[PDB]
Design a protein around this ligand. Structure first.
Ligand code: HEM
Length: 137
């Protein structure tokens, strides 16, 4: 279930973080414009870029903390507020986050692995609602 998936992701966070983040950028290539250091870099070039690994790790660690603090895939309003108020997110809208969760759920469905994809899609929906409530356009 969803709690086991957090443990699966955390066990190999760097690899899952890098692989899901790349799946996101490759499915929605316009999103790469927000990451001006990752423009014009192949998957293997980014795996060799220390800041890419550090960024993706820090993003997925926070995502897994928000997921673990959720109850029945409902995130805390305080965690949504953190994601809205972050300086690095100031230009974003809820559609950037729904694209990340669409990509994440499709990655999970395609993997060899027994992810609770329906729960990640619900979590993403609930998080988008919470981001909108915390003032994201
Ligand atoms: C639940 C989803 C997300 C979480 C948990 C998250 C978390 C984070 C964290 C923790 C950082 C700082 C990392 C560091 O200092 O190295 C960060 C940076 C950033 N985030 Fe997000 N983020 C999310 C979704 C998104 C989305 C959908 C976008 C844009 C499409 C985005 C754009 C950025 C950008 C542009 C930065 C600055 C890049 C950098 O660290 O150099 N984030 N995010």
């Amino acid at each position: 279930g969803f709690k086991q998936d957090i443990a699966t992701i955390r066990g190999d966070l760097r690899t899952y973080a890098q692989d899901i983040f790349l799946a996101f950028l490759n499915k929605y290539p316009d999103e790469r414009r927000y990451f001006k250091n990752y423009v014009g870099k192949s998957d293997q070039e980014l795996k060799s870029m220390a800041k890419f690994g550090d960024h993706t790790e820090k993003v997925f660690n926070l995502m897994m903390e928000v997921a673990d603090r959720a109850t029945d895939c409902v995130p805390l309003a305080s965690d949504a507020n953190t994601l809205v108020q972050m300086k690095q997110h100031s230009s974003l809208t809820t559609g950037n986050f729904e694209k990340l969760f669409v990509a994440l759920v499709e990655y999970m469905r395609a993997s060899g692995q027994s992810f609770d994809s329906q729960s990640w899609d619900r979590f993403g929906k609930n998080l988008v609602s919470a981001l909108s409530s915390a003032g994201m356009k």
